[PDB]
Amino acid sequence: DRGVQMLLTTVGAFAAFSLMTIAVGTDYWLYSRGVCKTEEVMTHSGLWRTCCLEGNFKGLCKQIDHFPEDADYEADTAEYFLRAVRASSIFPILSVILLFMGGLCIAASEFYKTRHNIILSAGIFFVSAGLSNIIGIIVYISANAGSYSYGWSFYFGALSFIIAEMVGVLAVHMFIDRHKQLRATARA
């Protein structure tokens, strides 16, 4: 139903935005043993800083350095570009921003019932947010490659992508119904 479709779209958009905002801000992305305050101790790392766990200095968090220039090595420009892209977290942040603008479009769709292009814009923003989340996940994993486990914060972004893509389907379906309804009325 139209009302239930709006309610589901809003709930899913809010859930996806909240999940991405939590995932980007939280530090439980990767479980890996590493040094502290730069010995070997198990820590958990996010996108900005890694917090040492169950160690003598547990609780303290060290800002992750994405440019280990200790040996003053450059290699190829592709590695530098990947490091720069991963360090800024440009793609997870872009996904969060796109989710926020899609939510804004969804909220503003109620005010203007005649302008149906806002629903389409919200759906486009949701799909683009999912794609940006995908690129961010790929870049993050590739940078980590260049024992370990993934924490709940990482899976929050993964679950947000599935929710954001599902809402994008709902929004375009709602846009499809709106134009069909307009065509149906013109038929009479």
Partner: protein, 149 residues
């Protein structure tokens, strides 16, 4: 010594992150194809690419089968082409890595049932799930038909 192969050891050639990203890319490609196929009313539908049909098309493309339909718009065809290239590269990489794993032993004989027992279990589970869904649909429709009369 060689350990007994795991039940789900058929996923070994590709890393877990690769499989997760494969599932995610499949979902994203399906959604993008459905979006670019049916969003514009000026194309209305001329095509048959709903969300269910888009998911079916992407699943068939990944397994190199193809169901019954093909995108006709330029955007849908671009999506299909990039998905086809992705599928070709990924499947070739899987086959090559499985060949490398079977050729070189680290710490050749015929593949035993223990090497594919996981895929057999998944197949039977899918059959059971399909039967359950069909029975649920039949029960839902039968009561609904009686409700009308």
């Amino acid at each position: 010594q060689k350990s007994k192969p795991g039940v789900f050891s058929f996923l070994d050639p590709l890393a877990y992150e690769i499989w997760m990203c494969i599932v995610f890319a499949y979902i994203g490609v399906s959604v993008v194809l459905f979006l670019v196929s049916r969003f514009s009313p000026y194309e209305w539908s001329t095509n048959e690419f709903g969300i269910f049909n888009s998911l079916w098309f992407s699943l068939g493309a990944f397994m190199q089968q193809g169901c019954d339909i093909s995108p006709r718009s330029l955007s849908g065809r671009i999506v299909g082409g990039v998905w086809w290239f992705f599928t070709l590269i990924i499947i070739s990489s899987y086959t090559a890595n499985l060949a490398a794993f079977l050729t070189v032993e680290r710490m050749t004989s015929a593949l035993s049932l223990s090497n594919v027992a996981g895929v057999f279990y998944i197949l039977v589970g899918g059959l059971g799930l399909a039967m359950l869904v069909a029975l649920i649909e039949f029960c839902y429709k039968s009561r609904a038909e009686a409700k009308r009369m």
